[PDB]
Amino acid sequence: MDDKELIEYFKSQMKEDPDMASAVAAIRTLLEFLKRDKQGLRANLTSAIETLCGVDSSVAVSSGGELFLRFISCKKIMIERGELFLRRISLSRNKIADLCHTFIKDGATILTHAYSRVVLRVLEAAVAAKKRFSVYVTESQPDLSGKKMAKALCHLNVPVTVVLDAAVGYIMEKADLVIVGAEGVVENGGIINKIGTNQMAVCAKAQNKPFYVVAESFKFVRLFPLNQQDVPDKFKYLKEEHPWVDYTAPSLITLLFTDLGVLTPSAVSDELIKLYLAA
Amino acid sequence: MDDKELIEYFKSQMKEDPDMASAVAAIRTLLEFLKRDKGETIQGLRANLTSAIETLCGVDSSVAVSSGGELFLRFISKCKKIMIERGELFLRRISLSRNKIADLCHTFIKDGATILTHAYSRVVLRVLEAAVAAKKRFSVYVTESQPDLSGKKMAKALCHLNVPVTVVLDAAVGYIMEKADLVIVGAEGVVENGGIINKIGTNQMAVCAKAQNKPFYVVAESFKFVRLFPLNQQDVPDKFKYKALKEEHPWVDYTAPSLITLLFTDLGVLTPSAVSDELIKLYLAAA
Amino acid sequence: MDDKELIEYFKSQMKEDPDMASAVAAIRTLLEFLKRDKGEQGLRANLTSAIETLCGVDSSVAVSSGGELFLRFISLAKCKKIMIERGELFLRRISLSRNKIADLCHTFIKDGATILTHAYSRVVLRVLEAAVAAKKRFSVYVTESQPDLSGKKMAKALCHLNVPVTVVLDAAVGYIMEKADLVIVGAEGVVENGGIINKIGTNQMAVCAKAQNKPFYVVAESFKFVRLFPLNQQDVPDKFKYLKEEHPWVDYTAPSLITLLFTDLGVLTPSAVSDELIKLYLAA
Amino acid sequence: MDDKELIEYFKSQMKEDPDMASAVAAIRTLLEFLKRDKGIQGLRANLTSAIETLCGVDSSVAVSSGGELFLRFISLYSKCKKIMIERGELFLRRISLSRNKIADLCHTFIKDGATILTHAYSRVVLRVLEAAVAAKKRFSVYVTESQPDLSGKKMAKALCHLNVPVTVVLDAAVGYIMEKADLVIVGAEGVVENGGIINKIGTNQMAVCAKAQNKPFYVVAESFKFVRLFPLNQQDVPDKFKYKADGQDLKEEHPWVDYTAPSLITLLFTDLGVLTPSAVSDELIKLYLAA
Ligand SMILES: [Cl-]
């Protein structure tokens, strides 16, 4: 392969299935790349392509890519362990759905932000459990991905209501819990997500509503932010500011439903070590 | 409805369905008895004559029949009463228990895991069903469980879900333990200290799993939470046991909380030590 | 003799005399094999071990350890065929083992004790008799021991001595353990690390006795010391062990689950067996 | 030794040393009774039992829990060789260590400059606060006078004689005063299986008010006070523990103790360690089985 063929197999892998995590698409592309040819001679040939996939700022593409590489270790066994990794990361969503939909009381009113493939999967699991619940979702500027989310939920016949980003503090009082996804989960158990998440978390804590995060383990990223500035620019981009993500501290999170299990923010560091040192 | 009717009604509830739990069949019978108790009159006597029947049903040594029965009468605080509204709301909820537990627990059965269980358990059965429905691949070892051999019945039920299963002697438990990844067991009752009262042979299976670091999981409904705190076997009421050249034949033994890893309930996953807080909330439900 | 006779002789040793250990019954048929066998040389040494395996009819571990020990200590030498006199010697010595043991044990069974046992054991019966008839009052608990219910058989034997005895289900060992003072058990075989192979169910009884701090004592003859070094159930040879069903006749109990072993060689803690075993196998 | 003797020996022990836990005074006289008892083994048993209950003439849960635990730990020609007395003294030697272990564990949680609120008189809380002055910590106390025996006042002097600032307040001013406190430290007459506690009437009220203002509620108590009860409400505390203790119009209400559920308690400081209410059931099993 090469640059032309990478930014392809990848970019279209996502077209054939827009339900697929940005990260999985990429890992899928690498695994494909290893299925190319003519030792460490190739090991550098790969690293040179994750950066290439820097054609998508996603924290996940970065961290998942790193994890995929670390999992690998003539070069057959590498295309094997890599397949055993892909097959594994694509089981995360079912796991997160099983684990989390259980925390949704029947008759609950849930508040979410923007669009999340995993959250959606969680709510589907809940209807499949015969749970009756309502949903409020932010419209989420500037791409209005919350309206997208509302549409998807409407098709699963879930009563959903779209409110303005500015109305979270206002609507909070009538919600029982908050469930949002993540772009990445940092070392301290906090999360990086679509701009607006932080405010929702702050507002939920003020009224004592549990704040749940659902995200795959491959989004575990090696960063320890102390505030909004410690979040690398590459992941978020005196008259106008436009960050796509913001950071939400562990103190503002109740639990994180991950494929590694249900976790408190502080328990994340232990899991993140076991994850990166897998084998 | 009189005593004759009750015992008949209760027995035909399980009749029309062997897969029903004893406490649920018993709770439904209190609901009918309640309904068919217009002959009564004072809101007090309904609640009073209703206690008289629990005992009648007590003709089922089962622990759950007591706790389910007690919990039922509790969830219910003139001649015209809305108690029945609560009694049906109560029935409506304990009927979701077994299933909440199955989709709560199956997620924890890893692929290729070998599971060890004891005798026959309706809850454990629903759990495994959810696991094959989840497309998971596992195998099972189950004690034949003397003296009624319910383990063999359990095994056949599993065989009909196409789950690979092997029946082994109650004595082969410590032997087979090394080839199991985890242990899943049901319960006749969940005690205040997070421990459990179950079919004889459970205690030693737990001790054995403990010595090999094998996780030990209990899956049980909340109506099985009972107001007892035993320190050893002797502390278990005979009403539930049937015991302590002679012979002894206790039908149940006691498993301490130090021997249980997690309990999977309709109230969520619990560690043994957290059972006491949930039992409180559960018994003071009405408030 | 010939295969036929061999087995027929063996089976008719324990049948008319169950009192006798399989191992001992095996060397007896072996003395006769040898005796009744005339006309050789190495032929003898080979035809004799090539039929000792035949006595495998008894998947019993003792037949194997016994046969070897017996064979090893008579081979030291048709005048050389006076191995027979060593065989009578050996068979004469091993027939004192039960007794040295029942003696090394009268001290540990204290007046008023409650003993928990598993299945049937001739050596255990002996020890308790040498204790009761020896002015001691105790009561016993024994597992019925599926599948041949040999536990009930043991019970009856204990009743005949008017010792109070209660039979419980194998499933009730962890239930009855709190009311036991100690457990005494026999062994089909003592392995090189001080552990033991015994009737299925023995293992879990030891694990429970240990969690409740109850001393676990094994009572067995030195001719049961076998050359095997298992670390788990999987290491025990199938040859001794025998919708699916698994029916292992015996299981292994690691040495850390054993307090003391009483043998004709003296009372031993599990970590002493290995050295004894060798100091035993290597005897002139 | 007959009943009159027991009682006098028991009250002497308490007059001898007023800082001695009531339960400690009790097992001591049980030990003395066991030493004199000139009566077979079975006798000795119900004898050292049909007196422990006689000591029950101090309707305190502790005296009951202590005795029970003592008989348990002590229990097991043969006659005389009773190694019971030896075990007895050993048990006695360990429980007398407890109070200090609590002092050490707890004072660590008293932030310098903190205002602590207490209820009635508690010997262990007194020891905890001494362990605090010793650690060079500066704090101030607020304590309820505690009707009807006004034991809170006596607590205030003890503290005054230790030089710690202390203010006495009416039992009715706890909700009012809560505002000024940083935390609540109260003792216990008994710790029940669910982690809750039985203590001087007025305790529950303080814990409920503490929780409402998110003030940490700490309990300091020796493990011989772990009792086998699982109360669900006030009516569940046996009457022998709340009455005779220390027409139309009725003062018919003079309970000496009340119950404080596990959800109103933050931490229990024990010789067995710093435990959260849920962890109590496992320690109570270990305590009662250890033997
Ligand atoms: Cl998906």
Question: SS in 3 state form for A40-98?
Answer: HHHHHHHHHHHCCCCCCCCHHHHHHHHHHHHHCCCCCHHHHHHHHHHHHHCCHHHHHHH
**Spatial separation of the C-alpha atoms in residues D235 and D237, rounded to whole Å:** 6
Backbone phi, psi, residue B236, to 5°: -85, 120
Residue D79 structure tokens: 């006659």
Bridge partners of residue A135, in order along the sequence: A110, A160
Q: Which of C98, C123, C112 is nearest to C164 (CA)?
A: C112
**Spatial separation of the C-alpha atoms in residues C206 and B104, rounded to whole Å:** 35
Decide: A and C in contact? Rule: 3+ Cβ pairs under 8 Å.
Answer: no
Q: Which of C110, C116, C56, C66 is nearest to C91 (CA)?
A: C66
Do residue B245 and residue C165 have CB atoms under 8 angstroms apart?
yes
- What SS3 class is residue A157? coil
| Contact between D76 and D84 (Cβ < 8 Å) | yes
CA A157 – ligand 1 centroid, Å: 19
Q: Encode chain C in three state secondary structure.
A: CCHHHHHHHHHHHHCCCCCCCHHHHHHHHHHHHHHHCCCCCHHHHHHHHCCCCHHHHCCCHHHHHHHHHHHHCCCCCCCCCCHHHHHHHHHHHHHHHHHHHHHHHCCCCCCCCEEEEECCCHHHHHHHHHHHCCCCCCEEEEECCCCCCHHHHHHHHHHCCCCCEEEECHHHHHHHHHHCCEEEEECCEECCCCCEEEECCHHHHHHHHHHCCCCEEEECCHHHECCCCCCCHHHCCHHHHCCEEECCCEEEECHHHCCEEEECCEEECHHHHHHHHHHHHCCC
How would you list the strands of the sheet with C189-190, edge to edge? C189-190, C196-199, C250-253
Asked if B287 is an interface residue toward chain D (Cβ–Cβ < 8 A), one would say no
**Spatial separation of the C-alpha atoms in residues B27 and B54, rounded to whole Å:** 9
| Contact between C166 and C139 (Cβ < 8 Å) | yes
Q: Which of D284, D283, D174, D272 is nearest to D227 (CA)?
A: D284
**Spatial separation of the C-alpha atoms in residues D128 and D123, rounded to whole Å:** 9
Q: Which residues of B touch A94 (CB under 8 A)?
A: 134
With a CB cutoff of 8 Å and minimum separation 6, the contacts of D289 are B231, B232
Asked if C233 is an interface residue toward chain B (Cβ–Cβ < 8 A), one would say yes
| Contact between A178 and A146 (Cβ < 8 Å) | no
Asked if B77 is an interface residue toward chain A (Cβ–Cβ < 8 A), one would say no
- Let me know the angle formed at the C-alpha of A159 by A156 and A160, rounded to the nearest 5 degrees: 95
Q: Which of C98, C106, C118, C122 is nearest to C14 (CA)?
A: C122
Asked if B117 is an interface residue toward chain C (Cβ–Cβ < 8 A), one would say no
Residue B166 structure tokens: 């092997």
Mutant choice from B276, B278, B284 vs D, greatest count of D C-beta within 10 A: B276
Q: Which residues of C touch B253 (CB under 8 A)?
A: 172, 174-175
| Contact between B195 and C224 (Cβ < 8 Å) | no
Q: Which residues of A touch B107 (CB under 8 A)?
A: 95, 98-99
Q: Which residues of A touch B95 (CB under 8 A)?
A: none
Q: Which of D161, D152, D271 is nearest to D221 (CA)?
A: D271
State which amino acid sits at residue B95. Answer: S
Asked if B235 is an interface residue toward chain D (Cβ–Cβ < 8 A), one would say no
**Spatial separation of the C-alpha atoms in residues B263 and B196, rounded to whole Å:** 10
Q: Which residues of B touch A129 (CB under 8 A)?
A: 100, 103
Peptide bond into C147 cis (omega under 30): yes
Residue D217 structure tokens: 């509620």
**Spatial separation of the C-alpha atoms in residues D37 and D48, rounded to whole Å:** 9
Residue D149 structure tokens: 């025996």
Domains in chain D with CATH codes: 2-95 (1.20.120.1070), 96-291 (3.40.50.10470)
- Please measure the distance between the N-terminal and C-terminal CA atoms of chain D and give it in whole angstroms: 28
Q: Report in angstroms the alpha-carbon separations of B265 from A132, B274, C246.
A: 20, 12, 32
DSSP, res A270: H
| Contact between B170 and B144 (Cβ < 8 Å) | yes
Q: B247-264 burial, b if ≥16 CB within 10 A, otherwise e?
A: ebebebbbbbbbbbbbbb
Overall residue count recorded for chain C in this entry: 284
Name the residue among A95, A102, A130 with its Cβ closest to that of B104: A102
| Contact between C180 and B233 (Cβ < 8 Å) | no
- Let me know the angle formed at the C-alpha of A228 by A222 and A234, rounded to the nearest 5 degrees: 60
CA A94 – ligand 1 centroid, Å: 7
Q: What is the DSSP string of D80-118?
A: TT-THHHHHHHHHHHHHHHHHHHHHHHHTT--TT-EEEE
Query: With a CB-CB cutoff of 8 Å, which residues 176-215 of chain C face chain B?
Result: 176, 178-179, 200-201, 203-208, 210-211
Q: CA of D270 to nearest chain B CA: how many angstroms apart?
A: 17
Angle between helices B43-57 and B22-35 (to 10 degrees): 150
Asked if A32 is an interface residue toward chain B (Cβ–Cβ < 8 A), one would say no
| Contact between C28 and C13 (Cβ < 8 Å) | yes
| Contact between B183 and B215 (Cβ < 8 Å) | yes
Quick one: which H or E segment has residue A183? none
Do residue A99 and residue B107 have CB atoms under 8 angstroms apart?
yes
**Spatial separation of the C-alpha atoms in residues A17 and C48, rounded to whole Å:** 75
**Spatial separation of the C-alpha atoms in residues D238 and B7, rounded to whole Å:** 36
Decide: B and A in contact? Rule: 3+ Cβ pairs under 8 Å.
Answer: yes
CA B101 – ligand 1 centroid, Å: 24
Strands B165-168, C244-246: parallel, antiparallel or unpaired by DSSP?
parallel
Q: Which of C278, C200, C189, C185 is nearest to C233 (CA)?
A: C200
Asked if B164 is an interface residue toward chain C (Cβ–Cβ < 8 A), one would say yes
DSSP, res D226: B
| Contact between C250 and C236 (Cβ < 8 Å) | yes
For B154, the closest chain C residue by CA position comes to C243
**Spatial separation of the C-alpha atoms in residues D122 and D19, rounded to whole Å:** 10
Mutant choice from B199, B248, B252, B253 vs C, greatest count of C C-beta within 10 A: B248
Query: Resolution of the coordinates in A?
Result: 2.7
Asked if B280 is an interface residue toward chain D (Cβ–Cβ < 8 A), one would say yes
Residue C242: CB atoms within 10 A of its CB come to 11
| Contact between B14 and B22 (Cβ < 8 Å) | yes
| Contact between B148 and B209 (Cβ < 8 Å) | no
Residue D130: CB atoms within 10 A of its CB come to 16
Do residue B103 and residue A102 have CB atoms under 8 angstroms apart?
yes
Burial status of residue D38 (CB atoms within 10 A of its CB: 0-12, 13-18, 19 or more):
exposed
- What SS3 class is residue D244? coil
Q: Which residues of B touch D195 (CB under 8 A)?
A: 276
With a CB cutoff of 8 Å and minimum separation 6, the contacts of C26 are C10, C52, C55, C58, C62, C63, C66, C67
| Contact between B225 and B282 (Cβ < 8 Å) | yes
- What SS3 class is residue A247? strand
Asked if A90 is an interface residue toward chain B (Cβ–Cβ < 8 A), one would say no
Do residue B107 and residue A129 have CB atoms under 8 angstroms apart?
no
CA torsion sign for C263, C264, C267, C273 is negative
State which amino acid sits at residue B134. Answer: A
Residue D184 structure tokens: 């609540």
**Spatial separation of the C-alpha atoms in residues A260 and A92, rounded to whole Å:** 8
Backbone phi, psi, residue C239, to 5°: -50, -25
Do residue C245 and residue B145 have CB atoms under 8 angstroms apart?
no
Q: Which of D111, D117, D110 is nearest to D177 (CA)?
A: D117
Name the residue among C159, C204, C247 with its Cβ closest to that of B173: C204
With a CB cutoff of 8 Å and minimum separation 6, the contacts of D64 are D56, D227, D241
**Spatial separation of the C-alpha atoms in residues D110 and D132, rounded to whole Å:** 8
With a CB cutoff of 8 Å and minimum separation 6, the contacts of B216 are B182, B183, B185, B205, B206, B209, B210, B259, B260, B261
- Please measure the distance between the N-terminal and C-terminal CA atoms of chain A and give it in whole angstroms: 27
State which amino acid sits at residue A74. Answer: C
CA torsion sign for B187, B190, B194, B198 is negative
Do residue B284 and residue D233 have CB atoms under 8 angstroms apart?
yes
Secondary structure of chain B: what % helix, strand, coil (to 5)?
50, 15, 35
**Spatial separation of the C-alpha atoms in residues A107 and A96, rounded to whole Å:** 21
Residue C8 structure tokens: 């027929």
CA torsion sign for C76, C79, C81, C82 is negative
